[PDB]
Each structure stands twice: as C-alpha cells, then as structure tokens.
Amino acid sequence: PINVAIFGSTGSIGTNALNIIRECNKIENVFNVKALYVNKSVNELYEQAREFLPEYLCIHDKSVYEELKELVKNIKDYKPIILCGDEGMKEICSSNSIDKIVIGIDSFQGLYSTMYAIMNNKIVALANKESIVSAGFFLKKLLNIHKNAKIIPVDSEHSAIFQCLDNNKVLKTKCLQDNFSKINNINKIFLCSSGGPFQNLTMDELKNVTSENAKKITIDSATMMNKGLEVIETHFLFDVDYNDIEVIVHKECIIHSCVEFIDKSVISQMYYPDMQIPILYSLTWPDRIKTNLKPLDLAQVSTLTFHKPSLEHFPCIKLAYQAGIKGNFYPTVLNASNEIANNLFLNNKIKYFDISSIISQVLESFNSQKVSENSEDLMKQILQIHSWAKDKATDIYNK
Amino acid sequence: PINVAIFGSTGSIGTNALNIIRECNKIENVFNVKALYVNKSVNELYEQAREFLPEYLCIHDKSVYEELKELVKNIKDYKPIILCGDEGMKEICSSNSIDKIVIGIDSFQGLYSTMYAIMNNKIVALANKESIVSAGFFLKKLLNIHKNAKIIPVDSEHSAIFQCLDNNKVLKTKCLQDNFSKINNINKIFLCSSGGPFQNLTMDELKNVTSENALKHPKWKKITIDSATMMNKGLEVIETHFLFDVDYNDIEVIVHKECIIHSCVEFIDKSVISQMYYPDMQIPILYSLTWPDRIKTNLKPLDLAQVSTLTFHKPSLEHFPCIKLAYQAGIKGNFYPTVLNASNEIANNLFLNNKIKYFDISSIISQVLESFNSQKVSENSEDLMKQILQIHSWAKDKATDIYNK
Numbered sequence: 001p002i003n004v005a006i007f008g009s010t011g012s013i014g015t016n017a018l019n020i021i022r023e024c025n026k027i028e029n030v031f032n033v034k035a036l037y038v039n040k041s042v043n044e045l046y047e048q049a050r051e052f053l054p055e056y057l058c059i060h061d062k063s064v065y066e067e068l069k070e071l072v073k074n075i076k077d078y079k080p081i082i083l084c085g086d087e088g089m090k091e092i093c094s095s096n097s098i099d100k101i102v103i104g105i106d107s108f109q110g111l112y113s114t115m116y117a118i119m120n121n122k123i124v125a126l127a128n129k130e131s132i133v134s135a136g137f138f139l140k141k142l143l144n145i146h147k148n149a150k151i152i153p154v155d156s157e158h159s160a161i162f163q164c165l166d167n168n169k170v171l172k173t174k175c176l177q178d179n180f181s182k183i184n185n186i187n188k189i190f191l192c193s194s195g196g197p198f199q200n201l202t203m204d205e206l207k208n209v210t211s212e213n214a215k216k217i218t219i220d221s222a223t224m225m226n227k228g229l230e231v232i233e234t235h236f237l238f239d240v241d242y243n244d245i246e247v248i249v250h251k252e253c254i255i256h257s258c259v260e261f262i263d264k265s266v267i268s269q270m271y272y273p274d275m276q277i278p279i280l281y282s283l284t285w286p287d288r289i290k291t292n293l294k295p296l297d298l299a300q301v302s303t304l305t306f307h308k309p310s311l312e313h314f315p316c317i318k319l320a321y322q323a324g325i326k327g328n329f330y331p332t333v334l335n336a337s338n339e340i341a342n343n344l345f346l347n348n349k350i351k352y353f354d355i356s357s358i359i360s361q362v363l364e365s366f367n368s369q370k371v372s373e374n375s376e377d378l379m380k381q382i383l384q385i386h387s388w389a390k391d392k393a394t395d396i397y398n399k
Numbered sequence: 400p401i402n403v404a405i406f407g408s409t410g411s412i413g414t415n416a417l418n419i420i421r422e423c424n425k426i427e428n429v430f431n432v433k434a435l436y437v438n439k440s441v442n443e444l445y446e447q448a449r450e451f452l453p454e455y456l457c458i459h460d461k462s463v464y465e466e467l468k469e470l471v472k473n474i475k476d477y478k479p480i481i482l483c484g485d486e487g488m489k490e491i492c493s494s495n496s497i498d499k500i501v502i503g504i505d506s507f508q509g510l511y512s513t514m515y516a517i518m519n520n521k522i523v524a525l526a527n528k529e530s531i532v533s534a535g536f537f538l539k540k541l542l543n544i545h546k547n548a549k550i551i552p553v554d555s556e557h558s559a560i561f562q563c564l565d566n567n568k569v570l571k572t573k574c575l576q577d578n579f580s581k582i583n584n585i586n587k588i589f590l591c592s593s594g595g596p597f598q599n600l601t602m603d604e605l606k607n608v609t610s611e612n613a614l615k616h617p618k619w620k621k622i623t624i625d626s627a628t629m630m631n632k633g634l635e636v637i638e639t640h641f642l643f644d645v646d647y648n649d650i651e652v653i654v655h656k657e658c659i660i661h662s663c664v665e666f667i668d669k670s671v672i673s674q675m676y677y678p679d680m681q682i683p684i685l686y687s688l689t690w691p692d693r694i695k696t697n698l699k700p701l702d703l704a705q706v707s708t709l710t711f712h713k714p715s716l717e718h719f720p721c722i723k724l725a726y727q728a729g730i731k732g733n734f735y736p737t738v739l740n741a742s743n744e745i746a747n748n749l750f751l752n753n754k755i756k757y758f759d760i761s762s763i764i765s766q767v768l769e770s771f772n773s774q775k776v777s778e779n780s781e782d783l784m785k786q787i788l789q790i791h792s793w794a795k796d797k798a799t800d801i802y803n804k
C-alpha cells in the first residue's frame with residue numbers, strides 16, 4: 001500500500017485528496033491513510049477519522065486537543081496516536097510508515113510543514129503556494145541535502161506540466177533541481193489560465209470595476225495575480241527561465257497547461273476542471289492507477305480557445321514576472337502587498353488599478369536581503385518581510 | 400552519432416527526413432546518412448548522394464544502374480557501394496554500420512524491406528501502411544524472435560500517440576508487443592482526423608456527391624478520395640491496434656479539422672495527454688530517429704494564441720461507412736485488412752472517374768470482404784509476400800466484378 005499523510009485534510013485540497021483516495025480504494029486497496037492534520041476543525045477531522053481510521057491524528061490548536069482525544073473514543077476498534085501542534089506535525093513527518101505527505105495547508109504553516117517533510121526525506125505532494133513563492137531557493141537547498149525527498153506539484157497547471165514530461169528523464173533529476181529543464185529537454189511552458197471574470201472588460205471599464213463584479217481567491221483570479229504566482233512557482237519547480245514561461249488564456253479549462261520541448265513538439269494534459277486527477281498523480285507518480293472518473297468527451301466539449309492576456313489590463317502579471325526576475329524575497333513582498341491590496345479592493349476602498357499600483361510601489365521600495373541559511377531563521381526572516389510588506393502597502397494606502 | 404538509412408529517399412517522407420537531418424546537423428552533427436535507396440529516381444538520388452555522401456546507394460530498378468554509376472563518377476573522391484534490387488536492399492539491412500532505417504517506400508516493397516530490417520535487428524522508423532495492414536501478425540512474430548529490432552511509427556497520428564507515452568514505460572516493452580497497452584496504462588486512444596472534404600455534408604448531399612467535389616476542396620487524387628471516405632483513417636485504426644496493442648473497443652476516431660492536436664491517449668486514471676504542432680512531418684520523423692531522446696531544432700514554435708480555436712466532433716459511421724468496414728476487417732483479422740485495402744484501391748478509382756456513387760464505394764468493399772475466404776498464413780517472409788500479392792490481386796479483380804454488377 002501507498003502510505004499517505006494529509007496535511008490540511010478538511011480544506012479544499014485535503015477533501016479532494018480523500019475523495020480520490022476513497023474512489024481508488026473501492027477499485028483496489030492502493031492507499032493507507034496513515035495521518036490527518038488540521039488547525040481547528042475538530043468535528044470535521046473527527047468525521048474523517050471515523051471513515052479513514054488513520055494511525056495518527058494531529059491538531060495544531062492545543063485548545064481543541066483534549067476535545068479531540070475523547071471524541072475519538074466514540075469510534076470503535078480505533079486507538080490512534082493523537083498529537084498536537086508543531087511537535088506533532090514533526091512526529092508525523094518522522095514516521096517510517098509514511099511515504100507521501102499531501103500539503104494542503106494555506107499560509108506559512110504550509111511552508112513550515114513542507115520543510116520538515118523534506119528534512120525527513122518524504123515525497124511531498126505540494127499545493128501550498130507560499131512554500132515556493134517565499135522559500136523556493138531554500139527548498140532547493142533542502143532537496144539538495146535530502147536526496148530521497150521530492151516535491152511533486154499538485155496545482156492543476158503544474159501537475160499538467162509535470163504529467164507532460166517523460167518520467168525516464170524526470171527520474172534522473174527531480175523538481176526544483178538545477179538543470180531540470182535541460183535534463184527534460186524543455187524549451188518553454190504554456191501556463192494555461194481560465195482568465196477570470198474580467199477578460200472581456202475594456203481599460204475604461206476596468207478603471208471603474210468593483211469587488212461585486214468579480215473571496216480572497218476570486219479577486220486573485222480577477223487580477224490574474226494567481227497566475228503571476230504560478231509563473232514564479234513554474235520557474236522554481238521546473239528550472240525554466242521567466243522569458244520561457246508564457247501565460248495563455250484558455251477559458252474552457254480543458255487543457256491544463258502545455259510543454260514545448262527543444263524539438264518544438266508540444267505535449268499537453270487535458271481533463272475536465274477537477275482537482276482529483278492532479279492530486280492522485282502526485283500520489284501515484286511515477287505510475288498511474290485505475291479511477292472511476294467520467295472520461296473526457298472531446299467531441300462533446302466541441303471548442304477549445306486560446307488568447308494572450310493583455311498586460312495593460314492585467315498588470316499584476318507584469319509585476320509577478322518583475323518580482324520573479326528580481327529574485328530574493330521580492331516574490332514574498334509581491335504576495336504580501338497583494339494580500340493587503342486584495343482586501344482594500346474587496347472593501348471598496350481602492351479601485352482595480354490601485355491594486356497593481358500599491359503592489360508596484362512596495363516592490364520598488366524593497367532592497368534584497370542576505371538569505372538565512374537555516375529553517376528557523378528563514379521562517380522568522382520571511383514573516384518579518386511579509387509583515388513589513390503588509391505594513392508598507394497599508395502605509396501607501398493611508399497616504 | 401545516429402547512423403541512418405533512408406529507404407525511399409526521393410519521396411515525401413524521404414525528403415522530409417533528409418531535410419530535418421540536414422537542419423539538425425547544422426546545430427550539432429548528430430546524424431550520419433549511411434545508405435539511400437530508391438526505385439528509379441537516379442537524378443534526384445545523385446543530388447542527394449552529392450550532399451550526404453552515403454556509404455551505400457541502392458536502386459531497385461537494376462536497369463538504371465549504369466546511369467547512376469556514371470553520374471556518381473562526377474563526385475570527387477567519392478566511391479560508394481552501389482547496389483541493385485532486393486539483393487541490395489538486404490545487403491544494406493545487414494550492414495552493421497546502420498542502426499536506424501526510415502522506411503518511406505510506398506506499397507509492398509515497403510513491407511518486404513521492413514521484414515528484412517527487423518530480421519537484421521534494426522530500429523525501423525515506419526511510414527509504410529501496407530506493412531502493418533497486410534502483415535501485422537507476422538511482424539509481431541518477427542519482433543519476438545529479433546529482440547533488438549523495433550518499429551517506431553512515423554505517421555503523424557501514430558507518432559503523436561507514441562510521444563504521449565511515458566518512456567519509462569515504453570522502455571519496459573516495445574511497439575507491437577502483447578501487453579504494450581497494459582504496461583503503458585493506456586485506456587483509450589483518440590485517433591485524430593482532418594475529417595476529409597466531405598465532413599460537413601448532409602446525408603442527402605452524400606448520396607449525391609461526385610469526385611469533383613472532393614478534388615475541388617482547397618484544403619486537400621487517390622489520397623484525396625481516401626481522405627473523403629475516411630478510409631485512410633480506417634487503415635490507421637488497424638495500424639493503431641497493432642502498434643499499441645489497443646483493442647478495437649478502445650480506439651475512437653475524432654474529427655479535428657485544424658490539424659494541430661495530432662492525437663491523444665486517455666490513461667487508466669482518465670487523464671488525457673495529447674501532442675500538438677503544425678501539420679509538419681518533420682517532428683514525427685525526427686522523433687523516430689532520436690527516441691527515447693529529443694534534440695534541438697529550429698522549427699517554427701507553435702503559436703497557440705494565433706491558432707486561437709481548436710475543434711472536435713464525432714464522425715457519423717452512417718456518413719462514413721468505410722470506417723465501420725475497417726473495424727470489422729481488423730476485428731476479423733487474417734488477411735481481411737489486405738482485402739479491405741485492395742478492394743478500396745479499385746472502388747476509389749471507380750469513384751474518381753465518376754463510375755459509381757459515393758455510397759457504392761463501401762458497398763463494393765463490403766462485398767469483396769464477404770466473398771473472401773480466410774487463408775492459411777505463411778510461416779516465412781518469402782511465402783507470405785507471394786501470398787499477400789496474390790490476395791491483393793484477387794481482391795482488386797473481385798472489386799472490378801462487383802462494379803460491373
């Protein structure tokens with residue numbers, strides 16, 4: 001059996017992961033769910049524990065900890081190891097009987113978890129964006145030291161790229177390693193985007209749009225900042241130059257991304273918009289297994305369309321390329337300032353273009369810092385810059 | 400270096416192969432063209448020999464040998480081995496300085512050459528349709544005996560399927576092996592088709608169409624009609640079945656008029672992988688020679704935003720019965736696909752010169768198939784070739800008879 005831990009099991013990624021594991025396990029017993037970990041959602045964790053009966057349970061908040069140990073007594077024939085906090089997260093990461101860890105934790109605990117999974121030589125099915133956006137350079141260092149550790153991407157677009165690769169080549173290297181694109185003969189990447197709800201809008205129309213027309217995630221789809229962050233993630237994951245990453249708007253969301261190889265042949269991965277396939281592939285790689293999913297009916301789909309995004313209309317994309325090319329903690333600053341700008345737009349306090357304007361001014365003010373060479377100092381360093389960047393964005397608004 | 404022979408070097412496949420080879424060599428000297436083989440195109444062969452300077456030259460038609468020999472004399476410091484006919488073909492196949500052979504010969508000499516390449520443990524970059532359509536079963540047997548021989552498909556759709564596969568799995572097996580599709584986790588194949596010039600016509604227009612309508616179409620003589628009826632795609636279904644050990648149950652023809660997605664593979668998890676490029680035979684040929692690797696080219700990059708729209712529809716088996724007939728013929732096996740192809744050759748020509756109706760094409764083919772009696776399969780290459788030509792000739796005659804009917 002493949003022994004899997006699910007970090008952030010009650011969220012969107014965690015829930016889809018459990019959905020697809022359940023489905024596959026009905027066909028043949030392929031997965032053992034060995035561990036589940038959440039922040040505060042004790043009752044939802046409880047119901048998952050009842051179905052999946054994992055050897056380990058962990059909850060980040062100590063207040064609901066004992067509130068979890070006695071709930072579990074209601075489950076018959078079930079005597080799990082119940083753990084709490086960072087210390088419990090680390091105990092799960094250390095377990096010899098766990099092979100793969102799905103990281104579906106939002107924010108910086110996602111990054112912290114990713115670091116300890118790698119340090120324990122695990123396969124990490126990564127969904128968390130902060131991990132690579134903020135510590136791409138340091139994850140590369142950890143992966144260099146921890147030879148058997150791997151990051152396998154779970155986001156639909158990144159999984160698509162990963163699936164288009166030849167595993168004969170992938171097995172010679174791994175994600176986030178220097179020379180990855182050379183070993184895999186990659187020339188460029190087409191990063192597909194739904195385009196969000198603003199694609200048809202004019203500049204003058206955009207000048208006056210409000211949040212009602214388009215919570216956090218939806219606004220990032222509207223501005224296409226989400227795609228900008230994915231560009232940065234692509235660069236790290238696959239060692240592809242920024243100049244060789246092209247964002248493409250494919251509104252039907254059937255083609256999930258494409259890889260052009262050095263001979264100019266293009267390979268792409270297709271399915272209905274569903275997060276189950278990418279998650280399953282992260283857990284089965286380098287193999288595939290049977291599912292019961294509805295087969296793609298291309299004739300039924302009928303029409304697939306592609307256009308270039310206008311950078312004037314979506315300058316958040318421009319800023320993400322700028323921040324990636326600049327490197328250092330500029331992507332951390334990009335993400336933090338976006339968080340503030342996002343919220344201000346949601347509360348009708350700024351206009352659409354003020355979002356990119358604020359982000360642009362925070363980036364302009366940042367200076368490159370020397371990178372911390374250990375996990376704990378880096379976490380502090382990243383949270384410091386994140387906070388600074390959030391503070392600066394707020395300052396610019398108030399001024 | 401990759402040491403290559405080009406069989407049928409003066410035809411479309413052969414000249415595409417030399418073109419991509421030349422272009423790739425400019426970037427990095429990767430290929431050595433060791434042998435060139437044609438039927439009778441002596442001037443064109445001489446022109447190629449001047450540039451590529453292969454160790455071997457072969458002409459099938461022994462009668463133009465002196466003409467070739469005298470032309471070759473013009474090339475300073477060049478003394479190739481100049482050979483003739485089957486003896487020459489077999490000699491090239493057995494040469495140890497040739498690792499890969501592009502087979503771009505049309506009709507049955509393509510099959511004969513394919514057998515001998517396999518018998519000599521070569522990598523065969525195969526474009527010729529007759530090979531698999533007429534001797535798929537037998538090629539399978541040869542590939543089991545000659546362990547280091549491989550077929551790698553060169554036609555655009557078959558190459559696309561092949562490129563969609565995970566080479567970590569492909570390396571565990573090879574094309575035409577039993578269990579190829581199980582080892583590669585293949586669930587279903589989307590075999591893409593341009594759709595032919597008749598794709599948009601109603602049932603009523605199809606009862607009425609004539610060959611001029613097909614020939615008039617801007618996007619596309621024999622080849623054009625086979626595209627119109629979709630019999631070309633029917634043959635490619637039979638090829639697909641053998642190349643990838645995919646059961647007929649699991650091959651779906653889909654019409655994609657833009658010709659950008661070249662085919663797709665649905666895997667057992669339902670994830671779908673497709674290969675995409677401009678219609679250009681250079682990529683499929685190159686891949687057959689560089690597999691399992693890829694090398695740099697200077698080909699025009701695919702501009703997806705410029706292409707803008709990609710479309711798909713299901714072809715109606717009522718509108719294109721030739722597809723239905725190809726499946727039945729493949730399912731039956733034996734020499735039925737030889738019969739399908741041969742009877743089609745006549746019915747095609749009949750429709751071309753306005754002698755029969757569109758729907759008569761399939762009617763004739765179906766009838767020759769019904770008439771055919773399963774034959775005992777020859778156990779060696781020579782007897783089998785004789786057998787195949789005999790059955791081919793029979794089926795052509797039978798088709799002429801049902802025309803008269």
Ligand SMILES: NC(=O)C1=CN([C@@H]2O[C@H](COP(=O)(O)OP(=O)(O)OC[C@H]3O[C@@H](n4cnc5c(N)ncnc54)[C@H](OP(=O)(O)O)[C@@H]3O)[C@@H](O)[C@H]2O)C=CC1
Nearest residue numbers: 008010011012013038039040041060104105109127128129
């Ligand atoms: N949703 C999607 O389809 C995709 C999401 N992403 C990325 O994946 C990450 C998470 O996505 P998503 O699942 O949507 O987010 P959700 O908010 O839906 O889920 C977050 C999960 O993480 C848990 N969590 C939060 N903090 C902690 C912590 N301190 N310790 C342990 N667990 C914690 C939550 O637990 P609790 O229930 O207790 O709050 C919850 O289970 C994000 O970084 C996002 O950008 C990327 C690609 C696709």
Ligand SMILES: NC(=O)C1=CN([C@@H]2O[C@H](COP(=O)(O)OP(=O)(O)OC[C@H]3O[C@@H](n4cnc5c(N)ncnc54)[C@H](OP(=O)(O)O)[C@@H]3O)[C@@H](O)[C@H]2O)C=CC1
Nearest residue numbers: 407409410411412437438439440459504505508526527528
């Ligand atoms: N053209 C294409 O885009 C594709 C073609 N194919 C397949 O490839 C095969 C041929 O392709 P294509 O290049 O188009 O055909 P062509 O007519 O363009 O080329 C045929 C070549 O074969 C040579 N030839 C014919 N008979 C013999 C023989 N007895 N011995 C040695 N050489 C011979 C010809 O030489 P000479 O010049 O002297 O007559 C010529 O070089 C066909 O079976 C077809 O199904 C498959 C996919 C795509």
Ligand SMILES: [Mn+2]
Nearest residue numbers: 155156157230
């Ligand atoms: Mn995404």
Ligand SMILES: [Mn+2]
Nearest residue numbers: 554555556635
């Ligand atoms: Mn074809």
